[PDB]
Amino acid sequence: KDPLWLYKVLLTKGIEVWFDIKLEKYGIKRNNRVDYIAKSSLQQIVFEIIGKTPKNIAVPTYIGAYEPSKPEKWEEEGIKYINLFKPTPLMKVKPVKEMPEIVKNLLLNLFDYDAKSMGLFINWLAFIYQYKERTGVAWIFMGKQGTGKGLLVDLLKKIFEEHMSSNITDANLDSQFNPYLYNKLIVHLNEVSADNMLVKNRLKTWITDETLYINRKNMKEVEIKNFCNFIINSNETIPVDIEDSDRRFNVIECNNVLKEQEWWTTESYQEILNNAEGFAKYLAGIKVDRSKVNEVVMSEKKKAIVETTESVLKQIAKALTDRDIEWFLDNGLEGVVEKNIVNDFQWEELQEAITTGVIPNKYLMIIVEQILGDSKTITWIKRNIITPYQVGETTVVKMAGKPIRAIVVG
Amino acid sequence: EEKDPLWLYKVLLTKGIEVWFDIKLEKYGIKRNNRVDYIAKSSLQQIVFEIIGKTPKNIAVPTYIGAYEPSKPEKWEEEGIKYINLFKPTPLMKVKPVKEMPEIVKNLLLNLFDYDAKSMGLFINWLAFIYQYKERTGVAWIFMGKQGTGKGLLVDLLKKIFEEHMSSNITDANLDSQFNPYLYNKLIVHLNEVSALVKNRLKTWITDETLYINRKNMKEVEIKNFCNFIINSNETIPVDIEDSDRRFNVIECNNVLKEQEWWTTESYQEILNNAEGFAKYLAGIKVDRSKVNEVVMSEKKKAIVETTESVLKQIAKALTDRDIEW
Ligand SMILES: [Mg+2]
């Protein structure tokens, strides 16, 4: 008579069953807990609940999908979907405008009291909480332990519960499975090393990729819409190679240990966590600037990281290109004069050369020997500076009367 | 017992579902609303039940071979073998030709090729060909240079047109994975270089008639290759480029978008909303077929080669060429 009788009878009892054509797995939903089970396992559940093991599981075929904004069910095109996102308690909570004070002190302590970046993070966090989308930006919190980086994780972990992954390590990534990304709004990573590959570089795409592949054990490899947002806690060690011109990472050094503050009592740690609801309420009541979510800033620490990560040869080439003497002097070129590698006259010619962007071989070698600490041949300097960073062309120019081999910037 | 060996096939066609058994994959295929899935038998029996109210012991459907042939019809019969098509066009693939490209999209493209018509137009001729003719080009494009030049935006833009036919932001990690579905039924395959060179295998993917496809819970299977490769990199060479190279166009772009006049906030999003516009434009190109697989010695490609190639080679060549000047 009826292809869905069993569906309905189990709905009568507050269980929603379906077959998930995508995962070829029967899904089941009670009390905002979603599980996927094989058929036999369902038959075992069904038996317990109606006292009959039917040969045919009379349930609808949906596609389970983690769409936080969308309803309990919907039908894109001709396909009926069912939702795997169920909001946590503290996601369904009444807006407020004040943030709990002890929570505020944590956040202040953490951003070293800098409103700009702190407020930007709250705008990010709010957007994630409220709109529940991918930002395309990630936050790195580095600096010494006990600065409440880990506490911020626990705090958030409470608000988001199942939608957050916590303390994911390099080891978890080397695992062939990766359920730490399945149905996650926030994904926290811990770095723990003395690094100085940086396998968390793979993350950079995750930040911005529309979709992820999800290999789970005993499940099909499946591609899903990406709702991930990434926080990374680090020791001092840099966890990701940061390009100069970077748009994904906000970096926040915090070395304000909590136990060295006035306001820190014993019960503070726990007090903070008890105010999770308070901080949820606050986040729910933010008025979200949508343009500031994916904004990044050149914090002091991000700059230090870049100027150490980027190749010294690049930095030379850029100073050659920019005709930027000041850089070379900042990096101790003036030492050429002290050691009598060159006289007062030639030193004028040498500086002139950098600025004008016309550099005789014997000055180029003198410069690059002096900046780098041992002598490099023209050949090397060409192959490892001038050529790869397109500084310019090797040519002749007549200086005085003699024709001189030179590099002509441009 | 049986009167008709395909009754079930037909009844499910009545309801706009096309079911078959793939001999190649020994997996039952199913097609609704231009979404193709492959499922085990039990899973099909579960679907069938829901739709007719009867679980038959025998799945009365035709045996075809699923094949991703974009040019070819919904079905055909090479030799004596009936095939069924896994290519279904996305919305913006079926869209009406035009001759003007949306202006804000044009500014992206201009920005990206540093306003160089030659190479830019060549890329449009490539992209058009892929869009229109839907074949393997045998050429690939590398976009390197600093972030926020709209390399990533061009990927999202195209990702909207091609949808499921393009793989996005494939990394070294994905390649070290034993599976590789990022090549299964793909017209475009985008890669991110992030290191500060395992992608040399792509060299061959660009030109190989066929690929092996290891997918989880599926048989390793060999398929006709429709891949075309874009690689975003961030100043790190992703692939060893031979002096005399015919596969790679390289395009350095350091024009950050946020440093242009025309860049507003809503620009990022505006660009993506014009995906349909840019699709329409691509559909209306008149494709020079000889220029598709053309490559050029951009400034950056040369720099890459003269740094990649061995100094000892360069000495020897100067000895050979009797070239004092070098
Ligand atoms: Mg092959």
CB under 8 Å, gap of 24 or more: what pairs does B195-198 form?
A: B195/A197, B195/A201, B195/A241, B195/B236, B196/A241, B196/A243, B196/A309, B196/B236, B197/B237, B197/B238, B197/B239, B197/B240, B198/B172
Technique used by the depositors: X-ray
CA angle A37, A76, A290 (to 5 degrees): 100
Q: Cβ contact (<8 Å) for B168 and A210? A: yes
Contacts with B, A 112-171, CB within 8 Å: none
Determine the 3-state secondary structure of B306 from DSSP: helix
Largest CA distance in chain A: 106
Interface test with A, best of B47, B50, B184, B192 (most A CBs within 10 A): B50
For residues B129 and B17, state if they share a domain: no
Q: Which residues contact B77 (CB under 8 A, 6 or more apart)?
A: B83
A175 in contact with B, Cβ within 8 Å: no
Nearest-CA residue of chain B relative to A24?
Answer: B43
Instruction: Say how far residue B259 (Cα) sits from the centre of its chain.
Output: 30
Contacts of B182 in chain A (CB under 8 A): 213
For residues B83 and B170, state if they share a domain: no
For residues B131 and B183, state if they share a domain: yes
CA–centroid distance, A221 to ligand 1, in Å, is 24
Q: Cβ contact (<8 Å) for A3 and B51? A: yes
Number of H helices, E strands in chain B: 11, 13
**Nearest one of A298, A145, A334 to A233, comparing CA atoms:** A145
Amino acid symbol at A293: V
CA separation for the pair B83, B73 (Å, rounded) = 10
For residues B53 and B23, state if they share a domain: yes
CB atoms within 10 A of CB A269: 15
Q: What is the extent of the structural domain holding B250?
A: 89-309
For residues B27 and B120, state if they share a domain: no
For residues B159 and B280, state if they share a domain: yes
Closest Cβ opposite residue A244 in set B146, B195, B215: B146
CB atoms within 10 A of CB B125: 20
For residues B216 and B303, state if they share a domain: yes
Contacts of A27 in chain B (CB under 8 A): none
Distance from CA of B129 to the nearest CA of A (A): 25
Contacts of B167 in chain A (CB under 8 A): none
CA angle A149, A154, A155 (to 5 degrees): 90
For residues B122 and B158, state if they share a domain: yes
For residues B177 and B109, state if they share a domain: yes
Q: Cβ contact (<8 Å) for B217 and A221? A: yes
CA separation for the pair A179, A214 (Å, rounded) = 7
Q: Cβ contact (<8 Å) for A387 and B303? A: yes
Largest CA distance in chain B: 90
Contacts of A391 in chain B (CB under 8 A): none
Domain limits, chain A:
1-86, 87-310, 311-410
Query: Taking a C-beta distance cutoff of 8 angstroms, is the pair B28, B22 a contact?
Result: yes
CA dihedral of A61, B93, B95, B269, whole degrees rounded to 10: 90
**CA B128, B129, B135, B141 torsion: positive or negative?**
negative
Q: Cβ contact (<8 Å) for A55 and B55? A: yes
For residues B76 and B181, state if they share a domain: no
Query: Taking a C-beta distance cutoff of 8 angstroms, is the pair A355, A323 a contact?
Result: yes
CA separation for the pair B154, B169 (Å, rounded) = 12
Nearest-CA residue of chain B relative to A241?
Answer: B196
Determine the 3-state secondary structure of B281 from DSSP: helix
For residues B93 and B204, state if they share a domain: yes
Q: What order do you get walking across the sheet with A25-30 strand by strand?
A: A33-37, A25-30, A16-20, A61-65, A81-83, A73-74
Contacts with B, A 31-60, CB within 8 Å: 39, 55-60
For residues B41 and B133, state if they share a domain: no
**Nearest one of A167, A160, A150 to A272, comparing CA atoms:** A150
Distance from CA of A195 to the nearest CA of B (A): 15
CB atoms within 10 A of CB B4: 9
